[PDB]
Design a protein around this ligand. Structure first.
Ligand SMILES: [Ca+2]
Ligand SMILES: [Ca+2]
Ligand SMILES: [Ca+2]
Ligand SMILES: [Ca+2]
Lengths: 84, 86
């Protein structure tokens, strides 16, 4: 599973998700708010595509390993996400 | 690294740089890229650009993997939505 974090360097509230394609509604149901994610852990061999807008549209930021900082553009922008 | 779209062939005219992602017509226009406008593009190494004729990634699809001074006659001024990925 992938773990998403509120704050940089794996800080604040955290929620883990198995692979899948999660819309904003599905994220909210798992207690992940909109425009909230700052860091994440990604198991080796997995890809996380973070989308700026809902339904897997808008800018996409790709992570293939643990990161304490998603970057200036990606920070607090996650609205949908694909994990595969 | 970003994809730069140009108004005219040979990287001419107005230009807009875009990060990877799946952009609908609405999102393209918000990024200041008009409909049916793109004529050439620069593509970062190892990136793929899927240019769609219609909205929501439908219609004819043209694919580019390097700097392209001439998108081709069919593709020219037809970009309405686009997927950029590595
Ligand atoms: Ca945050
Ligand atoms: Ca967002
Ligand atoms: Ca043009
Ligand atoms: Ca078109």
């Amino acid at each position: 599973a992938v773990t998403f974090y509120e704050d940089i360097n794996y800080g604040g509230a955290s929620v883990s998700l198995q692979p899948g394609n999660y819309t904003l509604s599905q994220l909210n149901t798992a207690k992940i708010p909109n425009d909230w994610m700052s860091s994440l852990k990604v198991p080796s061999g997995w890809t996380v595509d973070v989308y700026e807008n809902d339904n897997f549209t808008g800018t996409k930021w790709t992570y293939t390993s643990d990161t304490p900082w998603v970057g200036n553009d990606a920070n607090d922008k996650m609205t949908s996400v694909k994990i595969y």
